[PDB]
Amino acid sequence: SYYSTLQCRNNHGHCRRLCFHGEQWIGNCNGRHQHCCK
């Protein structure tokens, strides 16, 4: 599925293994250890 990845997109986040400084871990994208970072 891509639903969670797409929702990261819709939320203006980025799917990352680790969130960058200043970014909040607001969800997960699809895939393994793909975190939605905003």
PDB file of N, CA and C in Angstrom:
ATOM      1  N   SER A   1       0.860  -1.233   0.000  1.00  0.00           N
ATOM      2  CA  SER A   1       0.000   0.000   0.000  1.00  0.00           C
ATOM      3  C   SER A   1       0.863   1.236   0.000  1.00  0.00           C
ATOM      4  N   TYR A   2       0.279   2.319  -0.475  1.00  0.00           N
ATOM      5  CA  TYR A   2       0.904   3.624  -0.485  1.00  0.00           C
ATOM      6  C   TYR A   2       0.123   4.617   0.339  1.00  0.00           C
ATOM      7  N   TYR A   3      -0.967   4.180   1.001  1.00  0.00           N
ATOM      8  CA  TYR A   3      -1.846   5.110   1.700  1.00  0.00           C
ATOM      9  C   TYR A   3      -1.093   5.969   2.704  1.00  0.00           C
ATOM     10  N   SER A   4      -0.225   5.361   3.496  1.00  0.00           N
ATOM     11  CA  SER A   4       0.439   6.155   4.526  1.00  0.00           C
ATOM     12  C   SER A   4       1.490   7.061   3.908  1.00  0.00           C
ATOM     13  N   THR A   5       2.212   6.561   2.926  1.00  0.00           N
ATOM     14  CA  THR A   5       3.141   7.432   2.222  1.00  0.00           C
ATOM     15  C   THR A   5       2.427   8.643   1.614  1.00  0.00           C
ATOM     16  N   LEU A   6       1.259   8.413   1.009  1.00  0.00           N
ATOM     17  CA  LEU A   6       0.516   9.498   0.370  1.00  0.00           C
ATOM     18  C   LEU A   6       0.012  10.499   1.397  1.00  0.00           C
ATOM     19  N   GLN A   7      -0.376  10.008   2.559  1.00  0.00           N
ATOM     20  CA  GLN A   7      -0.821  10.907   3.605  1.00  0.00           C
ATOM     21  C   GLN A   7       0.328  11.738   4.142  1.00  0.00           C
ATOM     22  N   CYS A   8       1.542  11.173   4.212  1.00  0.00           N
ATOM     23  CA  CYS A   8       2.711  12.005   4.527  1.00  0.00           C
ATOM     24  C   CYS A   8       2.816  13.128   3.520  1.00  0.00           C
ATOM     25  N   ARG A   9       2.732  12.785   2.239  1.00  0.00           N
ATOM     26  CA  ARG A   9       2.769  13.805   1.207  1.00  0.00           C
ATOM     27  C   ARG A   9       1.716  14.870   1.448  1.00  0.00           C
ATOM     28  N   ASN A  10       0.463  14.442   1.662  1.00  0.00           N
ATOM     29  CA  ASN A  10      -0.638  15.382   1.839  1.00  0.00           C
ATOM     30  C   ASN A  10      -0.416  16.259   3.052  1.00  0.00           C
ATOM     31  N   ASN A  11       0.346  15.776   4.029  1.00  0.00           N
ATOM     32  CA  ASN A  11       0.658  16.532   5.234  1.00  0.00           C
ATOM     33  C   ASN A  11       1.901  17.390   5.082  1.00  0.00           C
ATOM     34  N   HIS A  12       2.529  17.394   3.904  1.00  0.00           N
ATOM     35  CA  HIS A  12       3.772  18.131   3.663  1.00  0.00           C
ATOM     36  C   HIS A  12       4.911  17.629   4.542  1.00  0.00           C
ATOM     37  N   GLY A  13       4.946  16.321   4.787  1.00  0.00           N
ATOM     38  CA  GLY A  13       6.087  15.703   5.416  1.00  0.00           C
ATOM     39  C   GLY A  13       6.990  15.032   4.401  1.00  0.00           C
ATOM     40  N   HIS A  14       8.058  14.444   4.929  1.00  0.00           N
ATOM     41  CA  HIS A  14       9.019  13.693   4.139  1.00  0.00           C
ATOM     42  C   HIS A  14       9.211  12.333   4.789  1.00  0.00           C
ATOM     43  N   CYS A  15       9.213  11.264   3.984  1.00  0.00           N
ATOM     44  CA  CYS A  15       9.453   9.908   4.472  1.00  0.00           C
ATOM     45  C   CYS A  15      10.954   9.700   4.630  1.00  0.00           C
ATOM     46  N   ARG A  16      11.401   9.508   5.880  1.00  0.00           N
ATOM     47  CA  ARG A  16      12.807   9.346   6.216  1.00  0.00           C
ATOM     48  C   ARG A  16      13.000   8.189   7.176  1.00  0.00           C
ATOM     49  N   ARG A  17      14.175   7.565   7.085  1.00  0.00           N
ATOM     50  CA  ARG A  17      14.608   6.634   8.121  1.00  0.00           C
ATOM     51  C   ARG A  17      14.801   7.341   9.456  1.00  0.00           C
ATOM     52  N   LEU A  18      15.306   8.577   9.436  1.00  0.00           N
ATOM     53  CA  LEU A  18      15.434   9.382  10.647  1.00  0.00           C
ATOM     54  C   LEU A  18      14.957  10.796  10.368  1.00  0.00           C
ATOM     55  N   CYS A  19      14.266  11.387  11.315  1.00  0.00           N
ATOM     56  CA  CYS A  19      13.782  12.740  11.125  1.00  0.00           C
ATOM     57  C   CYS A  19      14.934  13.695  11.356  1.00  0.00           C
ATOM     58  N   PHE A  20      14.947  14.769  10.592  1.00  0.00           N
ATOM     59  CA  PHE A  20      15.997  15.752  10.726  1.00  0.00           C
ATOM     60  C   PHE A  20      15.733  16.625  11.945  1.00  0.00           C
ATOM     61  N   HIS A  21      16.802  17.274  12.409  1.00  0.00           N
ATOM     62  CA  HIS A  21      16.655  18.304  13.427  1.00  0.00           C
ATOM     63  C   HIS A  21      15.554  19.273  13.033  1.00  0.00           C
ATOM     64  N   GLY A  22      14.738  19.664  14.013  1.00  0.00           N
ATOM     65  CA  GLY A  22      13.645  20.588  13.772  1.00  0.00           C
ATOM     66  C   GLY A  22      12.397  19.956  13.187  1.00  0.00           C
ATOM     67  N   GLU A  23      12.440  18.683  12.831  1.00  0.00           N
ATOM     68  CA  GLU A  23      11.297  18.013  12.231  1.00  0.00           C
ATOM     69  C   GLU A  23      10.594  17.148  13.270  1.00  0.00           C
ATOM     70  N   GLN A  24       9.296  17.103  13.187  1.00  0.00           N
ATOM     71  CA  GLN A  24       8.485  16.286  14.082  1.00  0.00           C
ATOM     72  C   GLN A  24       8.123  14.967  13.391  1.00  0.00           C
ATOM     73  N   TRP A  25       8.210  13.876  14.148  1.00  0.00           N
ATOM     74  CA  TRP A  25       7.824  12.537  13.706  1.00  0.00           C
ATOM     75  C   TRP A  25       6.312  12.432  13.830  1.00  0.00           C
ATOM     76  N   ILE A  26       5.606  12.643  12.721  1.00  0.00           N
ATOM     77  CA  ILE A  26       4.162  12.817  12.796  1.00  0.00           C
ATOM     78  C   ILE A  26       3.399  11.578  12.362  1.00  0.00           C
ATOM     79  N   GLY A  27       4.087  10.560  11.860  1.00  0.00           N
ATOM     80  CA  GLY A  27       3.461   9.345  11.411  1.00  0.00           C
ATOM     81  C   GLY A  27       4.522   8.466  10.781  1.00  0.00           C
ATOM     82  N   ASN A  28       4.072   7.372  10.158  1.00  0.00           N
ATOM     83  CA  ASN A  28       4.929   6.534   9.336  1.00  0.00           C
ATOM     84  C   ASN A  28       4.389   6.481   7.915  1.00  0.00           C
ATOM     85  N   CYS A  29       5.315   6.422   6.966  1.00  0.00           N
ATOM     86  CA  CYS A  29       5.023   6.068   5.584  1.00  0.00           C
ATOM     87  C   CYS A  29       4.962   4.549   5.465  1.00  0.00           C
ATOM     88  N   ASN A  30       4.567   4.050   4.297  1.00  0.00           N
ATOM     89  CA  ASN A  30       4.675   2.625   4.042  1.00  0.00           C
ATOM     90  C   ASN A  30       6.145   2.235   3.877  1.00  0.00           C
ATOM     91  N   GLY A  31       6.386   0.934   3.889  1.00  0.00           N
ATOM     92  CA  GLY A  31       7.747   0.444   3.923  1.00  0.00           C
ATOM     93  C   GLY A  31       8.208   0.228   5.349  1.00  0.00           C
ATOM     94  N   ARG A  32       9.449  -0.237   5.487  1.00  0.00           N
ATOM     95  CA  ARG A  32       9.973  -0.597   6.799  1.00  0.00           C
ATOM     96  C   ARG A  32      10.866   0.528   7.296  1.00  0.00           C
ATOM     97  N   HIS A  33      10.564   1.016   8.497  1.00  0.00           N
ATOM     98  CA  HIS A  33      11.303   2.127   9.088  1.00  0.00           C
ATOM     99  C   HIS A  33      11.315   3.353   8.167  1.00  0.00           C
ATOM    100  N   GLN A  34      10.158   3.652   7.563  1.00  0.00           N
ATOM    101  CA  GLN A  34       9.964   4.866   6.779  1.00  0.00           C
ATOM    102  C   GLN A  34       9.070   5.781   7.598  1.00  0.00           C
ATOM    103  N   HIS A  35       9.680   6.783   8.215  1.00  0.00           N
ATOM    104  CA  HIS A  35       8.968   7.676   9.110  1.00  0.00           C
ATOM    105  C   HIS A  35       8.577   8.936   8.379  1.00  0.00           C
ATOM    106  N   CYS A  36       7.364   9.395   8.619  1.00  0.00           N
ATOM    107  CA  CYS A  36       6.912  10.649   8.072  1.00  0.00           C
ATOM    108  C   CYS A  36       7.385  11.787   8.973  1.00  0.00           C
ATOM    109  N   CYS A  37       8.250  12.642   8.434  1.00  0.00           N
ATOM    110  CA  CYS A  37       8.934  13.684   9.193  1.00  0.00           C
ATOM    111  C   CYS A  37       8.557  15.051   8.629  1.00  0.00           C
ATOM    112  N   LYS A  38       8.150  15.956   9.510  1.00  0.00           N
ATOM    113  CA  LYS A  38       7.671  17.268   9.110  1.00  0.00           C
ATOM    114  C   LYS A  38       8.219  18.391   9.991  1.00  0.00           C
TER     115      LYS A  38
END
